[PDB]
């Protein structure tokens, strides 16, 4: 059988988590009381009486958003000890997560992970959902990812990240505890999808027409991406890609695994019923230079490998025409050592609609997950942000007091610098 | 069929005794007014194991109540499911025997023991099909320890061929009201080794710890502490009441578990144990009750089994199930815990099926087991015994009613024998 | 907003007691009343893991060794039913 664990670390992991688990329950017709009124697995474990329980762990050091789930509309659906909340927030301190109070949450979280990593078989992927620039997401994310790479080894891990944006930021220490967070995504991660806030901020006020996107609308759009990623696992389709061919077709070199995301068609109900949305321009709007979910101009760099998870009423003869259209375009470049670089897949269900959400149901969607050279500049903005920080050692006393040793700041500098060196070395 | 005679002695013993008669009456569908309820053949074809029929058809208990107080006798009489008990088997004794082995065994309790053997007699020779006795009592007090083991002794020379089965309540060191537990219990183990053949150790430490951890309880009342005991009591004698696939017995338990005849002290488990929060949320199957029966806390005694070695165990299952899954679960749990079983006893696991599940559940198991970690508590309360015996702590209450100091050292020497025999078989 | 405090003068009349939960989560992800649902536990107390009883007990020999015509009907209701070939082939 198939199953993926859905570890949600941090407050962003919880808020994204209750939106993706919202959508998984909607597409399988599973109510919050667990009852259907064999595709429930890869996300749900049957418990005898029709009680489908999700396969995740809600993980947050502070008891304010986990307890909100334990009092909200999903206080039933989620298993009680599956939800784990500690006592204090990590105060946007990577030392407070990875070298302080996080340990007494690691033991319980790895225990419950071990419970539901042996209740069924397969164990295809370990989905992670964390916020890089924050506190408990960066610290408890680094501890728990490093422990699973030793214990639950040789199993793929997909770290959906909410990486800090260049001009938008909600915390002044995000330059520190993101460079101090790359060293878990560089040596304990097989696939690291970079989603940020600015590029999905903009994608809602010109495509969804919403002048007030809130964080829930952000959590719905990432929920569509994770749904189309894991749709080819559960539901039967055409030529298919799952988590293991996902690594052997997007990761050319072992340490080059930082890639982007793009979803289409995100167009509201007043708007989507006017266009064709045909297979030619829904992948062409996927390769649109502003349509990525990451602030990354793709034209100061060459593409490396892309997977096109089409989902719905697509026929494989239609995808080969759209592949030919994108290749003949002279805006998207490619490296010379990758002649063919599109590993597409097609499922048969249309993407599901959320009643009350600001989307209309289309019968096909394009989610591209593309590895590009241009992702190096995304990390390079906060290379410059850390340099302004570390010149006069701002905010170090909060870090060194908890558990820090003053040298991992320079170790993280060399880890990101050697990371940038390889993106300009691969594309020659 | 096989008559089982229930006798409960002491303030503690009558409280578990009443709770046990809530549970088996729910299993057999009997109202508190005595009449039978429902159309449930599988709970009525073996009604004579614990019940007797009586003139108007009331399923009268075979239960005998002794306690030298007018204390919990009338609280269980006025309480629910207390109108079952015969208003003849209540033998009171109105003077009190507070926290003294002398006032239960040698003086005072010796005059009322001449009437409770009468009630044991006329109940048991009515039908000469007695499989065993079932004694409940605490050793950390007065009436329960003294008169409890006094009936334990005199029943054995009158029926010297049949089981007596004690669900004993041992001192429970940390939570210990009153101060004479090391004197009372240590001066009571040396009869529970000689004229006993089936002893079930129950502590209030691990009973509280089951409550605080596998149930997460905040205000564990004395009612539902006894509900855990009564569930395990009803599960260890489930085959004498219900048909099964691999039929167990109390004597099948006795012959198969105990080695050389002084090693009859057993931990007890009953492990579909969850809270009500995670009560709908559990795949209730054979491979995971085995994981829950074999991890420390779930054992009702406060002696940690991972510090010792199960010499012989039993896995008396109850419910709808398929049998090679219990057989391979016994073999693999012996395989991973090979250091926790004994090299000169192959296959240290009894198995059985009582078919009919417990009420409310769909499967369950009673894990009774001989452990060589059981001397952990024996050395614990003997250490408390010798710490008081060196300085001659409160003893004039004991010897004033008439006992010798030489008798106490015989108790400590006989109990220190039990520490050594377990050690050399470990 | 003192005009809304005229009617709850003790407020312990249970009319305004616990009638709001006013967070962004309830703004965003709710429908009709599936948050205040009582948790069904057991009708027989703390032991009973679910709802079952004497009406479901059927021991193995009774449950499978019933007469063949009854088992015949019960499973007819659930779907009971060098090489060599025929003389046609060469």
């Amino acid at each position: 059988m198939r199953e993926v664990i859905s570890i949600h670390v941090g407050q962003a992991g919880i808020q994204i988590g209750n939106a993706c688990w919202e959508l998984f329950c909607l597409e399988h017709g599973i109510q919050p009381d667990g009852q259907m009124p064999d595709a429930f697995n890869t996300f749900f474990s049957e418990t005898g009486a029709g009680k489908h329980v999700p396969r995740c762990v809600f993980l947050d050091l502070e008891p304010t958003v986990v307890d909100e789930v334990r009092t909200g509309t999903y206080r039933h659906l989620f298993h009680p000890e599956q939800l784990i909340s500690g006592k204090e927030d990590a105060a946007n301190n990577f030392a407070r997560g990875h070298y302080t109070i996080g340990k007494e949450i690691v033991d319980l979280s790895l225990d419950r992970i071990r419970k539901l990593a042996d209740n069924c078989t397969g164990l295809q992927g370990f989905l992670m959902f964390n916020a890089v620039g924050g506190g408990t997401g960066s610290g408890l994310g680094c501890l728990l990812l490093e422990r699973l790479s030793v214990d639950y080894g040789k199993k793929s891990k997909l770290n959906f990240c909410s990486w800090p944006s260049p001009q938008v930021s909600t915390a002044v220490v995000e330059p520190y505890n993101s460079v101090l967070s790359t060293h878990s995504l560089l040596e304990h991660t097989d696939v690291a999808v970079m989603l940020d806030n600015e590029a999905i901020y903009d994608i809602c006020r010109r495509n969804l027409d919403i002048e007030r996107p809130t964080y829930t609308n952000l959590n719905r759009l990432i929920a569509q991406v994770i749904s189309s990623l894991t749709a080819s696992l559960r539901f039967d389709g055409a030529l298919n890609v799952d988590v293991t061919e996902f690594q052997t077709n997007l990761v050319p070199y072992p340490r080059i695994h930082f890639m982007l995301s793009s979803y289409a068609p995100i167009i509201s109900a007043e708007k989507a019923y006017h266009e064709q949305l045909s297979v030619a321009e829904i992948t062409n709007s996927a390769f649109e230079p502003a349509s990525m979910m990451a602030k990354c101009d793709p034209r100061h760099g060459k593409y490396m490998a892309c997977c096109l998870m089409y989902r719905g009423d697509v026929v494989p003869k239609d995808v080969n025409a759209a592949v030919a259209t994108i290749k003949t375009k002279r805006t998207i470049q490619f490296v010379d050592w990758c002649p063919t670089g599109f590993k597409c897949g097609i499922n048969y269900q249309p993407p599901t609609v959320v009643p009350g959400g600001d989307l209309a149901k289309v019968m096909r969607a394009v989610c591209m997950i593309s590895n590009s050279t241009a992702i190096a500049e995304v990390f390079s903005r906060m290379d410059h942000k850390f340099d302004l920080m570390y010149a006069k050692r701002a905010f170090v006393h909060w870090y060194v007091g908890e558990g820090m040793e003053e040298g991992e700041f320079s170790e993280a500098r060399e880890d990101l610098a050697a990371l940038e060196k390889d993106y300009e070395e691969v594309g020659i | 069929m096989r008559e089982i005679v229930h006798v409960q002695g002491g303030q503690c013993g009558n409280q578990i005794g009443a709770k046990f008669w809530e549970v088996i009456s729910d299993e057999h569908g009997i109202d508190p007014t005595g009449t039978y309820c429902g159309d449930s053949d599988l709970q009525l074809e073996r009604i004579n194991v614990f019940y007797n029929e009586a003139t108007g058809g009331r399923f009268v208990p075979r239960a005998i109540l002794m306690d030298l107080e007018p204390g919990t006798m009338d609280s269980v009489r006025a309480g629910p499911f207390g109108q079952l008990f015969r208003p003849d088997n209540f033998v009171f004794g109105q003077t009190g025997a507070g926290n003294n082995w002398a006032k239960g065994h040698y003086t005072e309790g010796a005059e009322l023991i001449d009437s409770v053997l009468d009630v044991v007699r006329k109940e048991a020779e009515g039908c000469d099909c007695l499989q065993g006795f079932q004694i409940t009592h605490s050793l950390g007090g007065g009436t329960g320890s003294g008169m409890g083991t006094l009936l334990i002794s005199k029943v054995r020379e009158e029926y010297p061929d049949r089981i007596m089965e004690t669900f004993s309540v041992f001192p429970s060191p940390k939570v210990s009201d009153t101060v004479v537990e090391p004197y009372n219990a240590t001066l009571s183990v040396h009869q529970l080794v000689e004229n006993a053949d089936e002893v079930q150790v129950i502590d209030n430490e691990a009973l509280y710890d089951i409550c605080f951890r596998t149930l997460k309880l905040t205000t564990p009342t004395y009612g539902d502490l006894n509900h855990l005991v009564s569930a395990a009591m009803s599960g260890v004698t489930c085959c004498l009441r219900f048909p099964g696939q691999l039929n167990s017995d109390l004597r099948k338990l006795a012959v198969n578990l105990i080695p050389f005849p002084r090693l009859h002290f057993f931990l007890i488990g009953f492990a579909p144990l969850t809270s009500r929060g995670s009560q709908q949320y559990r795949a209730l199957s054979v491979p995971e009750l085995t994981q829950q029966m074999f991890d420390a806390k779930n054992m009702m005694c406060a002696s940690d089994p991972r510090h010792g070695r199960y010499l012989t165990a039993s896995a008396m299952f109850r419910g709808r199930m398929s049998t090679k899954e219990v057989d391979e679960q016994m073999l693999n749990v012996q395989n991973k815990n090979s250091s926790y079983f004994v090299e000169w006893i192959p296959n240290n696991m009894k198995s059985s099926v009582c078919d009919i599940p417990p009420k409310g559940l769909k499967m369950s198991v009673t894990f009774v087991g001989n452990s060589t970690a059981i001397q952990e508590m024996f050395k614990r309360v003997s250490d408390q015994f010798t710490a008081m015996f060196r300085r001659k702590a409160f003893l004039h209450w004991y010897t004033g009613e008439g006992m010798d100091e030489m008798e106490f050292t015989e108790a400590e020497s006989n109990m220190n024998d039990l520490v050594s025999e377990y050690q050399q078989y470990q | 907003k003192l005009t809304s405090w005229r009617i709850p003068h003790p407020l312990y009349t249970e009319l305004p007691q616990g009638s709001k939960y006013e967070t962004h989560y309830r703004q965003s992800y709710d429908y009709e009343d599936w948050a205040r649902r009582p948790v069904r536990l057991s009708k027989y107390g703390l032991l009973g893991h679910d709802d079952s009883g004497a009406e479901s007990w059927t021991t193995e020999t009774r449950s499978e060794y019933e007469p063949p015509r009854l088992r015949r009907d019960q499973l007819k209701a659930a779907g009971q039913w060098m090489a060599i070939h025929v003389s046609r082939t060469h």
């Binding site: 206080r75 009680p80 | 997460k216 905040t218 205000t219 809270s275 009500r276 929060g277 | 948790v39 536990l41």
Partner: peptide
């Protein structure tokens, strides 16, 4: 505070 999610079911308050 502690097991709030449980502690209404046996005794409501």
């Amino acid at each position: 505070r502690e097991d709030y999610i449980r502690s209404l079911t046996p005794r409501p308050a």
